[PDB]
A paper describes a structure:
Light–oxygen–voltage (LOV) domains are small photosensory flavoprotein modules that allow the conversion of external stimuli (sunlight) into intra­cellular signals responsible for various cell behaviors (e.g. phototropism and chloro­plast relocation). This ability relies on the light-induced formation of a covalent thio­ether adduct between a flavin chromophore and a reactive cysteine from the protein environment, which triggers a cascade of structural changes that result in the activation of a serine/threonine (Ser/Thr) kinase. For example, in the green algae Chlamydomonas reinhardtii (C. reinhardtii or Cr), phot allows the light-dependent regulation of several molecular processes (e.g. phototaxis, sexual differentiation, photoprotection) and control of gene expression. The C. reinhardtii phot protein consists of two successive photosensory protein modules, LOV1 and LOV2 domains, and a Ser/Thr kinase effector domain [Fig. 1(a)].
As expected from the CT characterization, the CrPhot­LOV1 crystals belonged to the P6522 space group. We used the model coordinates of the CT dark-state structure to calculate initial phases and then manually adjusted them with Coot before refining them with Phenix. Overall, the electron density was of excellent quality and enabled us to observe variations in the positions of residue side chains (with an RMSD of 0.189 Å between the dark state at CT and RT). The reactive cysteine (Cys57) exhibited two alternate conformations, as observed at CT, but the variation of the 2Fo − Fc map contour at RT clearly indicated a change in the distribution of each conformation [Figs. 3(a) and 3(b), respectively]. Conformation A, in which the Sγ atom of Cys57 is 3.5 Å from the C4a of FMN, was equally present at RT along with conformation B (i.e. 0.50 and 0.50 for A and B conformations, respectively), in which the Sγ atom of Cys57 is 4.4 Å from the C4a of FMN.
Author numbering: 17 to 125
The structure:
């Protein structure tokens, strides 16, 4: 299988904080749950992250749509990796967005 990590963000809170992350997410990024849970995942961004790709995710989240972007991200120790990020909205039967799920793939290669 393709190596990847997975997270769940709560779309019922205004800033889409993370409520769950797979073990690989913590291992890959170097952050622990104490530093991650309850926070928006944007802490992974840094100097070289392309604001235009970030904008795409921001837009997809506001519209409740899925989106896939390639983003420069940084580990806790400050080292970079290329992240192919797919975000999927999870909707309740009334059509409202409850959760976003994110799949990260380290495509640094
Ligand atoms: C489920 C989910 C997973 C996300 N995963 C990442 C990620 O791995 N790396 C990243 O830079 N941003 C990720 N984001 C994007 C940020 O959390 C945030 O939505 C993005 O930076 C746009 O918002 P902002 O303009 O307010 O920062 C994720 C967002 C969601 C909802």
């Amino acid at each position: 299988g393709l190596r990847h990590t997975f997270v769940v963000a709560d779309a019922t809170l205004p800033d889409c904080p993370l409520v769950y992350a797979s073990e690989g997410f913590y291992a890959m990024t170097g952050y622990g749950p104490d530093e991650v849970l309850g926070h928006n995942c944007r802490f992974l961004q840094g100097e070289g992250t392309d604001p235009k790709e970030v904008q795409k995710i921001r837009d997809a989240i506001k519209k409740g749509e899925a989106c896939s972007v390639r983003l420069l991200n940084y580990r806790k120790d400050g080292t970079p990796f290329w992240n192919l990020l797919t975000v999927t909205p999870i909707k309740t039967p009334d059509g409202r967005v409850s959760k976003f799920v994110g799949v990260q793939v380290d495509v640094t290669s």
